[PDB]
Amino acid sequence: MGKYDKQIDLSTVDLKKLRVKELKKILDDWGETCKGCAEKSDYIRKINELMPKYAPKAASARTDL
């Protein structure tokens, strides 16, 4: 098997590598979006604020074991 391996990626994604439109997607999927935000890093803050509320599958840190 190759080219496809998973049905989720928010568990392992890098919000710094994404763009504002891709951060807006994560926020809109939970139904929760900022209204005075104007910089890419503030959408990363609004995600990390709400990821433990709606995505325990991604709020937890990685482990080598």
DSSP string, 19-65: -HHHHHHHHHHHT---SS--SHHHHHHHHHHHHHHH-HHHHSPP---
**4-41: buried (b, 16+ CB within 10 Å) or exposed (e) per residue?**
eeeeeeeeeeebeebeeeebbebbeeeeeeeeebeeee
| Six-digit token string for 2 | 């190759």
Distance CA 49, CA 38 (A): 17
| Six-digit token string for 53 | 């509320």
CATH number at residue 64: 1.10.720.30
Distance CA 40, CA 20 (A): 6
How many domains, the chain? Answer: 1
Q: For Cα atoms 20, 45, 35, give the angle at the middle one, nearest 5 degrees.
A: 65
Structural domain for 52, as ranges: 1-65
Distance CA 32, CA 27 (A): 5
